[PDB]
Design a protein around this ligand. Structure first.
Ligand SMILES: *[C@@H]1O[C@H](CO)[C@@H](O[C@@H]2O[C@H](CO)[C@@H](O[C@@H]3O[C@H](CO[C@H]4O[C@H](CO)[C@@H](O)[C@H](O[C@H]5O[C@H](CO[C@H]6O[C@H](CO)[C@@H](O)[C@H](O)[C@@H]6O)[C@@H](O)[C@H](O)[C@@H]5O)[C@@H]4O)[C@@H](O)[C@H](O[C@H]4O[C@H](CO)[C@@H](O)[C@H](O)[C@@H]4O)[C@@H]3O)[C@H](O)[C@H]2NC(C)=O)[C@H](O)[C@H]1NC(C)=O
Ligand SMILES: *[C@@H]1O[C@H](CO)[C@@H](O)[C@H](O)[C@H]1NC(C)=O
Lengths: 53, 104
């Protein structure tokens, strides 16, 4: 606990949220690069509505 | 303005065929019931799931574009009365009634 001190903070100008924003982004891609790619899933799909009687 | 026939007949011990034609046949399903004279009607077929309801042996139903098909059991003996037909409009408001066939 700091006493007698009154340092001026800032939240909308704080750079801790900026490094947080950019850390999670580079972390999301790092956990998806070594996984199954779905490129041969773009083929002409022939669909019909589900069974609703 | 649905349409149910009122006069058809068939031989006993043979499969029959009940229809009911109407454009509001989507969000409506189908009623029928067989009111013996001076009595109260009973469940012709009843919905106990959103999928289907032809589990009991006596009766089954099929669906066409507008006309509905009420197939029935092989034996048509002993059970005879006029079979009405009822359904609901697309706005889920109103229930249409339009007669039904007496079979001998
Ligand atoms: C923002 O909030 C404001 C608050 O004022 C909203 O304004 C009103 O808010 C109330 C809050 O509850 C709303 O809810 C209730 O409205 C009913 C009357 O609704 C009837 O009309 C609406 C369309 O407006 C319709 O959706 C309702 O459907 C009900 O009933 C049908 C009927 O189907 C039955 O019959 C058919 C055959 O025709 C069958 O096929 C079917 O199987 C079934 O048997 C059902 O299908 C629906 O599921 C649904 O139940 C109605 O048709 C009032 O009656 C309610 O309150 C009154 O009674 C209660 C209970 O006693 C009482 O406490 C209260 O004081 C009232 O006397 C209640 O008001 C309003 O609709 C709503 N609109 C108005 C009129 O201002 C505003 O909408 C909100 N905004 C948003 C976007 O949500
Ligand atoms: C299936 O749903 C689509 C949604 O747009 C609709 O256009 C189409 O008519 C529906 N087909 C049937 C027969 O339900």
């Amino acid at each position: 606990h700091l006493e007698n001190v009154t340092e001026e903070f800032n939240m909308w100008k704080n750079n801790m949220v900026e490094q947080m924003h950019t850390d999670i982004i580079s972390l999301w891609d790092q956990s998806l690069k070594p996984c199954v790619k779905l490129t041969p899933l773009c083929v002409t799909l022939q669909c019909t509505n589900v069974t609703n009687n | 303005e649905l349409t149910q026939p009122p006069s058809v007949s068939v031989s006993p011990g043979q499969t029959a065929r009940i229809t009911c034609s109407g454009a509001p046949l989507t969000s409506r399903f189908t009623y029928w019931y067989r009111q013996k004279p001076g009595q109260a009607p009973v469940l012709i077929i009843s919905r106990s799931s959103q999928r289907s309801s032809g589990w009991s042996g006596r009766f089954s139903a099929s669906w066409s574009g507008t006309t509905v098909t009420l197939t029935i059991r092989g034996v048509q003996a002993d059970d005879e009365a006029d079979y009405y037909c009822q359904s609901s409009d697309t706005s889920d408001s109103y229930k249409m009634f339009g007669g039904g066939t007496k079979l001998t």
